[PDB]
Amino acid sequence: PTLALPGQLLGPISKYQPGPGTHVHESNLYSSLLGTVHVTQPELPTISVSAILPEVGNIVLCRVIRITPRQAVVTILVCGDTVLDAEWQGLIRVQDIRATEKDRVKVYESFRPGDIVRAEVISLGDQANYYLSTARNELGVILATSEAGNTMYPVSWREYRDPITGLTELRKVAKP
Amino acid sequence: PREVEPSLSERQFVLQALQEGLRLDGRQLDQYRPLSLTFGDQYGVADVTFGKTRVLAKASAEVTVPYADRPLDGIFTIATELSPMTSPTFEVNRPTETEVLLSRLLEKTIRRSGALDTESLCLVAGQKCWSIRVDVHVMSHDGNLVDAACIAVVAALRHFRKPDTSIESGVLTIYTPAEREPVPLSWLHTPFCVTWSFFGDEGEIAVLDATWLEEQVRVGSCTISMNKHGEICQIAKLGGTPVEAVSLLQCTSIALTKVKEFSDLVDKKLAEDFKRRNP
Amino acid sequence: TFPRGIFAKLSPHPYLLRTLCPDPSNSSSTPQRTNGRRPNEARPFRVNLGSLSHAHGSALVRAGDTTVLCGVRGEVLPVERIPLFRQPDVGRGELKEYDLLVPNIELATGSAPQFLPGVPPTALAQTLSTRVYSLLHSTRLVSAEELRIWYRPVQDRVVAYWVLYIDLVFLSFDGNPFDVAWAAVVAALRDTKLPVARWDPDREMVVCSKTETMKLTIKGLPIACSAAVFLEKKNRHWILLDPDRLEESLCKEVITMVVDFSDGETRIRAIEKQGGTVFGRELIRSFALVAEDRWKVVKEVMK
Amino acid sequence: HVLLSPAELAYLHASLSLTPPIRPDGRSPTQFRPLIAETGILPGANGSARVCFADGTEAIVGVKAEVEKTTGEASWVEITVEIPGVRDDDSGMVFLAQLLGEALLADGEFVKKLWINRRYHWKLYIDILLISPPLSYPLPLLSLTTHLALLSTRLPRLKSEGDEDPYFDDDWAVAPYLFPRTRPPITLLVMAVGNNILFDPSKEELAVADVALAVSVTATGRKLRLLSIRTIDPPSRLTPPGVPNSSEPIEPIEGVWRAPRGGAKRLVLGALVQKVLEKGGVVDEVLDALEGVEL
Amino acid sequence: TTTATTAPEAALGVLPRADGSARYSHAGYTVTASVNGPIEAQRRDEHPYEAHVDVIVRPAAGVGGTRERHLESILQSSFAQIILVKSFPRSLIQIVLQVEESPENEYVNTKLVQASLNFAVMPALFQTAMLALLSAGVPMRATATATAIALASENGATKTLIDPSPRQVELAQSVHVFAFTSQDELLLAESEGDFTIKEWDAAYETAKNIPDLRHFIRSTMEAKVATDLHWKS
Amino acid sequence: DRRRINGPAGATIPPVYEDSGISEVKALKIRSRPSNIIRKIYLKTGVTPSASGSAYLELETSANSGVSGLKLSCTVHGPRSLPRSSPFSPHMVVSTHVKYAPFATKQRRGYLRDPTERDLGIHLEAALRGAIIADRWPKSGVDIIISIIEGDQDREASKTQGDEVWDMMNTLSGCITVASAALADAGIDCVDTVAGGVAALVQDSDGSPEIVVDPIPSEHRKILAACCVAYLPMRDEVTNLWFRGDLPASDMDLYTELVEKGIQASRSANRVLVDCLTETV
Amino acid sequence: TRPFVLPGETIDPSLVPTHPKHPLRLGPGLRHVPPSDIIPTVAGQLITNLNKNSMWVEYNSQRYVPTQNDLVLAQVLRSTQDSYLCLITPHTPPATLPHLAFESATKKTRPQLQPGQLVYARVSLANRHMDPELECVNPSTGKADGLGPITGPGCVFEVSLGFARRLLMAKSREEGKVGVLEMLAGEDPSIGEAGAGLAFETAVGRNGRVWVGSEDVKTVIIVGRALQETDRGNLTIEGQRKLVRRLLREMR
């Protein structure tokens, strides 16, 4: 519950290990943020400050904005159940959509713009994009809306079905 | 966005046809497209059509305080901002190499030609001067905008009428059309632009009025502005592949002939409109 | 489903629809937006006149998160510098012939995410400026009689006109800009106290008293009311008064209604419906009552 | 602006961090690079000067004095900085334009010189051209050219009195000097790495500067007078980070570059300006070399 | 063409290069509109779901000031409600409107920079844009027609002026612009000046139940289609 | 411009006062505030919730309650994806935009944006960039926007008051403080809070000049020199030093004192800054 | 005659073809809604073909909307590491032409097309979401079937999409009423001044581009003018004969 200001001294590096929200300076550890201090106390105790960026291995929820026979470009909205105040573009390469038959899968059969995808960050990418892979049971489309504009439901892992228009659509369903 | 290009088939063929002395439009190399000049109901509106190229131009006069380049002088301006209507390639508030040269050639032509009496424009010195703005609207771009615009601009300015004015006890009175009949804008001589295009890799083939497709294939061009009396108001062969001086003199010699018929048309068309106004 | 925060970011329209439609399961639930404000509930205005020391008039108008600061700075325009000027008999009138009112809206960079420096510019600033400009003139809010500066020797002449540079800055933008912006303009103009100015024939220029000030004779109190339609599309439609930034992104259809009730009879000074067809003649007739209610509450703020 | 690799930067920082700073040029910390300059380069300009560094950058400055309708002093002088390829509004260009003007208008004596009479004042136009592409931070060279230019500036002698509109002899050889032989302000881009203070830094050196100051000075060693200081945002801050061999670093690892993460230590600022103003210091060296140029 | 003529006059394919185009003149106002069919949207306006509609308005004289920026927004919002923008998700639709003529107000000197809303010209712009969209074959949910009513007051009576001249607009006590969709729904309702809700509703009736623009749009479009489908036989 | 409602064609004149009595002008303002005491800083945080972090700063003109002078609104925008024309940067790119509010603009109609606005951006950019950890957020950018709502003196009036530069230093000092408040609000990793201190060497009599913290030129007959300092008390570091004034090199001690008091002003301002941030959370 | 319909004018179910065996194959200009109503999206004349249980709105327009299996005369804009981008229409988003989409094409034997190279290709794939893809092979056979880059000497002429469909329908002269090509080829007798017919090969894209090639420049110009002037003129078949008669005299 201790409130710390930017630049406030937290302790020497010999006592604590720098965590998020902290920075070292002349063998001393300071808080880089206005926020509450927290010590992990696991080696030395990690110390951090709480008042965010996507990171490899994180599970993110994103909105598909454009699809290309090669890659589908998505906007990252949530990282680890945390909404992001600012957004980042990510690419789901066709190789990264499915766990198997990566040659057979097509982007058009996986996601289409407007739907919400839960994906795993594969790498910080060159230029402006992250690289995200949905090739996992827990990853794929979460919210889908048919061409008719109705909110769909996942009839099977391969396709979503429409409750009002009845039509099915091929998309990369997330298993849970 | 960036201009669309013809396919290399079109590029090669157009060049091939010109070497045969033939054009896709059926016109000779030294021939213009059918010229239609229409005057709007309002004074100062002129609507020029060179086949598929249409350029609406409207003249306007507003009394304004004089500052900067003409601090006490009275100033005539030309605005020719192209719009997607011209072609989707063009974008609003985004001048282009085509637009900048088009505006540059027009303003130089009208100003350097001394067509307007600028001293006549200033109602008062350093306080109020008539500002003659002519707005050029390229309704459709099928090549040779510089030429179509010039006819529309001069047609509009000659068709345009100033509001009448009077100085009384030193008081400048500017009369709305309801108060007084607008007075025609004084006009000494009418310059007209002619835009040749050159296609041969040595510039040996000269074409008088280029279609948009031809303008994409030409290796150079040369705009010439002249009076009916042969006075050249400007020449602008702003680079491109070089052309033998004899060819350019041939181009100017021909251009004078085309200018004469343009001048006759505008004079005739203005007379025809005048009768509609005063039968 | 998702945690409410996540559900708000992705699929915002369904999330709002859920708040705006009290869930069928709960009788207790009542229609309400993501703000918790009801569809028929506007945001409370707060007006702090005299906020800017230099300005001849000013107001800091806060409507929820939206925050407009309006500053009216008067400058003198000699007639000798006015094309088309004529001595009045005591045309479009002096206000329009001479451009004596110069309103300009600044959607200050960063006032909202959509106005970030890197985001492409949008016309919203221009549209509001002209919306204010036309409404400012059509309402006849300011009379050129007040802006004239006379010589009156002891052969009367108008020697210059006061030019009101009505500058607005959206310190915070949370949707529904015109209502706040117009309120700031009216509030600031009511507060405007121009210095008493006179013609100095010896200096041959207009000079102003360092202490004496004349207040603008603002006539009427046109108050702008706005709303947006949210569609489930039975095509249920919810009318949202004072649409929040988020709500504007979802409601394609918006209505603006400027009414004056100083006569005790609502007089509609301007209407601006667009973006949809839900607002028929019936709703617009109904909305005139809503605007009158909005006028009554705002009247109590812009004392 | 300038681009260097972190490993390249790490070497530069380490070399300059040593107790005797081993500058890449082998130059002494107090030592300027060779100076090549010309005066009255442009005829028909009241003052003009050209300067070219061993770095290859060059700049030309011309001074036009125009009689304008107004001991009296107002900021009549205007400075323009023509950099090739800039939008005419860039941060660097405008920052320089204000900085040089700040130096001259710092004392306001210079404004006084341009006062023909109570009725009329010399409006002085300073146009600064960076002939070379901006390979390195222009400020040092531009300041030295402006110093040389102003020194070369001659002002038309006034045959007419003051209440009447001023009338001036036409001979340029008769016209007396502006700043006739206080001096026009010099400005030195001073740099610090660790405790070492460096003068006339190369773009490579300036790229690793922990602190960078634009110090404007004048003379009347010489009787120096400080006129202004401005902190040049160390370009080192915009450089890439170093990657150690096999997150927050706990230690300043040797040989691993890391952008200077804070500000300038309070004492270093005193040291940077103290060494600039020490009598017989760099300023005297610069003025000695500068004043040796023919005029 | 001029203000005195009751009959609207229109043409389609006026500008050949454009995808669709139309030249429309009524009550003294002439506007020529060019529509470009879904094309590459500049990344700025590449919406993921629907085509971006980009209305551009160019005045007969002077540069397009704030006034035009408003007209573009007014028409952009309304036509986006008319066009089936969902059919071209990432595309763009250009609608450039060029005001060729408006009744010259004989009682005012020319002012080009005026920034006041010009309801006077809104119907002509809307009609021409509607014709151009029909000419371009852009898919649409419905056609739409706009009308301008100026509620002049003379002596003790209020006088409705339909499609008024700008001089009438400035003299009018209030001016109204209604744009009714083919379904008879209201699409735009821009109004200004002092007026009671009763007066507005009365104008709503005048603009909605009346020259039959619905018929004019259909008749002119019939002629165009009948002309170019004459081959069908 | 196309984008703004242009005023009248003629050039409008700002009000010129009658100036009927010289006697009425009477005495020249004298600094009642102690030489080591800054103005009363009013600082608020979270004034623009739409932004990632924001703050508002306001000062009394001459330490008089209700007589507001400088007014600054700052809206830090949180690390956000960099534009794609320059899609990569190893270090977080601090971008500073400073604009006088139209009410605060030198000209109600201006052909050119004030050089002063660009200059303040560079100074503030240098000050904040030193205090912000760029390494933390690679491939991202953060934009600090300062809206100078009101200047401590009217722009056209400042021309008469000796020099605008002194006002600019006052403005910059505020910008540093408010921007730091916004940065702390936005949760941007900062090495230390940076506050903007300003101090001046002044001579209001024939006696020796005084060092004065947080000056205003109207209160002094002659400002010999002034210094603006972006200072980090927890680091004892200066991220942006700005000094102007003719000082003999023999007066190096005075300069040293002038900087130290300028740093003292920064400490004083930082006191308010931490108090506002502490109470904010 | 066919009923003319404006957009939004719902088709009366009496006019709607209904066939239990086949679902209604809606063509251009019509939109279906779940309520089972058929709404025209464009102004035109309603067409019904009970033999196919098909219905659509006939109309003429310029900008082509890529549709799968259409044959289009795309022009290559650029080459990427694996496909050649081609612009089907002048501002339409560039289509993708895979490098190996040509008969007998391999990484070794691929034809080296160049920027601006004209190519006659089928629309392999088209969706409202993705940009269209092109192909020259018939994937089920690998044969070109007349597709591929346009190598011969010739030029491309733009025409209205409706006119392009008239050329491409099998009964172009009888049903399409476009006899210009036959008249210039000399196949239409009694034209007068026939000159035994000109020699040319023409390929007509669904996108309104018609490439006409011939060793004779005059031939290409004449046929190009004929197609464009009959398209823009909506000329009757006799009007076409009058046109080519006029052109062939100018050709002299």
Residues D232/D157, Cβ–Cβ less than 8 Å:
no
CA distance A123 to A132: 7
Q: In C, residues 203-262, which contact F (CB 8 Å cutoff)? A: 205-210, 245
Tell me how crowded residue F169 is: count the other CB atoms within 10 A of its CB: 28
The residue among E133, E120, E118, E122 whose CA lies nearest residue E182 is E133
Q: Phi and psi at residue G155, in whole multiples of 5°?
A: -145, 160
CA distance D93 to D3: 19
To one decimal place, what's the resolution in Å? 3.2
Residues E127/E175, Cβ–Cβ less than 8 Å:
no
Q: Do chains A and F touch (3 or more CB pairs under 8 A)?
A: yes
Burial class (CB in 10 A: 0-12, 13-18, 19+), B24: buried
CA distance F228 to D54: 35
Extract the tokens encoding A43: 């080696």
Distance in Å, alpha carbon of B65 to nearest chain F alpha carbon: 6
Tell me how crowded residue D273 is: count the other CB atoms within 10 A of its CB: 24
Extract the tokens encoding C197: 């100015």
Contacts of B126 (CB under 8 A, 6+ apart): B66, B71, B72
Contacts of B67 in chain F (CB under 8 A): 11
State the number of CA atoms in the 13 A half-sphere of A145 facing the CB.
15
Q: Which residue of D has its CA nearest to A22?
A: D248
Q: Which residue of B has its CA nearest to E35?
A: B85
CA distance G37 to G40: 10
Contacts of B88 in chain E (CB under 8 A): 36, 39, 94
Burial class (CB in 10 A: 0-12, 13-18, 19+), F41: buried
Subunits next to E (3 or more Cβ pairs <8 Å) are A, B, C, F, G
CA D233 to each of CA D264, E42, E113: distance values in angstroms, whole numbers, following the listed order? 11, 36, 44
Residues A91/A131, Cβ–Cβ less than 8 Å:
yes
Who among E63, E64, E115 is closest to F5 (CB)?
A: E115
List the beta bridge partners of residue B46: B39, B57
Are the beta carbons of A69 and G127 separated by less than 8 Å? no
Residues B200/B207, Cβ–Cβ less than 8 Å:
no
Instruction: Tell the residue number behind the tokens 């009138």, with chain if given.
Output: C93
CA distance C67 to C180: 8
Contacts of G4 (CB under 8 A, 6+ apart): E218, E221, E222, E225, E226, G43, G44, G45, G46
End-to-end CA distance of chain G: 43
Extract the tokens encoding B236: 């602008």
Pairing of strands G25-26, G54-58: parallel
Contacts of E46 in chain A (CB under 8 A): 66
Pairing of strands C158-172, C104-106: parallel
Q: Which residue of F has its CA nearest to D185?
A: F246
Distance in Å, alpha carbon of C128 to nearest chain A alpha carbon: 27
CA distance E178 to E145: 8
Residue C275 gets the label, from left (phi > 0), alpha (psi -120 to 50) or beta, of left
Residue E129, amino acid: A
Residues C273/E189, Cβ–Cβ less than 8 Å:
yes
Contacts of F84 (CB under 8 A, 6+ apart): A127, A128
Running DSSP on this structure, what letter comes out for residue C16?
H
Q: How far is CA B170 from the centre of its chain?
A: 38
CA distance E195 to E206: 15
Are the beta carbons of E186 and C129 separated by less than 8 Å? no
Pairing of strands D120-129, D78-82: parallel
Distance in Å, alpha carbon of E190 to nearest chain C alpha carbon: 4
Extract the tokens encoding C84: 């088309």
CA distance A50 to F184: 12
What string of DSSP letters covers A94-128?
GGGT-SS-TTT--STTT--TT-EEEEEEEEEPSTT
Helix (H, G, I), strand (E, B) or coil at B197: strand
Q: Considering only CA atoms, give the Rg of chain A.
A: 21
Pairing of strands D120-129, D58-69: antiparallel
The 3-state secondary structure of chain G reads CCCEECCCCCCCCCCCCCCCCCCCEECCCEEECCCCCEEECCCEEEEEECCCCEEEEECCCCCCCCCCCCEECCEEEEECCCEEEEECCCCCCCEEEECCCCCCCCCCCCCCCCCCCEEEEEEEECCCCCCCEEECCCCCCCCCCCCEECCCCEEEEECCHHHHHHHHCCCCCCCCCCCHHHHHHCCCCCCCCCCCCCCCEEEECCCCEEEEECCCHHHHHHHHHHHHHHHHHCCCHHHHHHHHHHHHHHHC
What string of DSSP letters covers chain D?
-----HHHHHHHHHHHHSSS---TT---TTPPPPEEEEES-STTSSEEEEEEETTS-EEEEEEEEEEEE--------EEEEE-TTS-S--HHHHHHHHHHHHHHHTTSHHHHHT--SSSEEEEEEEEEE--S---S--HHHHHHHHHHHHHH-B---B-S-SSSPP-B---TTTSPBSS---PPPEEEEEEEETTEEEES--HHHHTT-SEEEEEEEEE----EEEEEEEE---GGGGSPPP-------SS--TT------S-EEHHHHHHHHHHHHSTTSHHHHHHHHHHTS--
Are the beta carbons of F88 and A9 separated by less than 8 Å? no
Q: Phi and psi at residue F127, in whole multiples of 5°?
A: -65, -50
Residues G92/E40, Cβ–Cβ less than 8 Å:
yes
Q: Gaps after which residues in chain C, C–N over 2.5 Å?
A: 90, 154, 233
CA E37 to each of CA C58, E17, E53, E93, E120: distance values in angstroms, whole numbers, following the listed order? 48, 12, 10, 6, 28
| Method for structure elucidation | cryo-EM
At residue D285's C-alpha, the angle toward residues D280 and D286, to 5°, is 135
The residue among D184, D189, D187 whose CA lies nearest residue D220 is D184
What string of DSSP letters covers D178-194?
SS---PPPEEEEEEEET
Are the beta carbons of C83 and B128 separated by less than 8 Å? yes
CA distance A76 to A132: 10
For chains B and E, count residue pairs whose Cβ atoms are closer than 8 Å. 92
Extract the tokens encoding C191: 């507060």
Who among E34, E62, E96 is closest to B135 (CB)?
A: E62
Subunits next to D (3 or more Cβ pairs <8 Å) are A, F
CA distance B91 to F48: 34
Contacts of G238 (CB under 8 A, 6+ apart): none
Q: Do chains A and B touch (3 or more CB pairs under 8 A)?
A: no
Distance in Å, alpha carbon of E184 to nearest chain C alpha carbon: 10
Tell me how crowded residue A165 is: count the other CB atoms within 10 A of its CB: 15
